[PDB]
RNA sequence: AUUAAGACAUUCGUGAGUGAUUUAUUUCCAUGAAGUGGCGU
């Protein structure tokens, strides 16, 4: 009876609880202008041996792109009435390292191997995941 | 039925070993067992 799932979704619920603001990772070109220019026998980027033009870049704001200050992958983006709002994945997921063992039950056993870290990853008050 | 299920950061471990409340310091300084005779003219 499963026909169609929507890729799940990160949507913040606020106090008035009327909308729902859906949450997106920020495209990696955000803030950039990307041209490809075409006067052609320029310059030409071989990606493994593959013909493609130039990607001159530069910031939407001239320099070029600085990849010191390229910090697109770390923000996640939402709709706003005017610009796009940007939310650290900080600010999103909490993350924790817990330490685990077994313990040594003696008169068996080879396992004092039994030692392991592991992730947990909590998400802000206002978050919840969803899918359609 | 979903890179899933099971798994104590636990076992052993004396805040203990050595250590003098001791060294230095005169109950001492000053000081008269002294003073006076009386009456019988």
């Not at 619920?13 to 803030?31: N, Q």
């Not at 075409?38 to 600085?66: H, L, M």
């Not at 940007?86 to 997921?93: N, R």
Request: proline share 5%; hydrophobic share 30%.
């Amino acid at each position: 009876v499963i026909k169609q799932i929507s890729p799940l979704m990160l949507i913040e619920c606020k106090d008035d609880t009327s909308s729902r603001s859906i949450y997106f990772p920020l495209p990696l070109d955000d803030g950039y202008k990307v041209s490809f220019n075409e006067t052609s026998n320029e310059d030409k980027v071989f990606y493994n041996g593959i013909e493609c033009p130039i990607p001159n870049v530069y910031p939407a704001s001239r320099k070029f792109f600085d990849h010191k200050t390229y910090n697109n992958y770390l923000f996640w983006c939402t709709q706003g009435n005017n610009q796009i709002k940007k939310l650290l994945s900080d600010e999103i997921w909490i993350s924790k390292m817990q330490i685990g063992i077994t313990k040594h039950v003696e008169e068996g056993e080879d396992n004092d191997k039994s030692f392991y870290k592991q992730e947990f990853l909590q998400l802000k008050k206002s978050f919840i995941y969803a899918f359609y």
